[PDB]
Amino acid sequence: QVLFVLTILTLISGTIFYSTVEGLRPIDALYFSVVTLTTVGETPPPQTDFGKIFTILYIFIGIGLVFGFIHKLAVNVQLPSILS
């Protein structure tokens, strides 16, 4: 469902934010965004106060969306695929 598009837009947004503000290469910016929203958290934190502030809000807004997608992918695509 739209979940796929909403997640991609969210990651694009994060990728744009962290390339600009934190000065990261897109792939690193997208990486950061992904591991942050999935709560994995394996990179170091944002160095700038604006990066911190954004990440805070990005987490509260982005996580439900990203885990809604991961959820539907699982019990909606992966489950029946496996069961075959």
Q: Which of residues 42-71 bind its own copies (CB under 8 A)?
A: 42-45, 49, 52-53, 55-56, 59-61, 63-65, 68-71
SS3 content of the chain, % helix, strand, coil (to 5): 75, 0, 25
Task: Establish if 23 lies at the interface with its own copies (CB under 8 A).
Answer: no
Report the candidate in 38, 6, 39, 44 with the shortest Cα–Cα distance to residue 18: 44
Task: Establish if 35 lies at the interface with its own copies (CB under 8 A).
Answer: yes
Residue for token pair 């996580």: 63
Residue for token pair 């958290």: 41
The nearer residue to Rb ion, 23 or 41, going by C-beta atoms, is: 41
Q: Could you tell me the smallest distance in angstroms from the CB atom of residue 50 to its own copies? A: 10
Cβ-count burial 1-13 (b if 16+ within 10 Å, e if not): eebeeebeebbee
Residues forming the site for its own copies (CB under 8 A) = 2, 6, 27-28, 30-31, 34-36, 38-45, 49, 52-53, 55-56, 59-61, 63-65, 68-71, 73-75, 78-79, 82
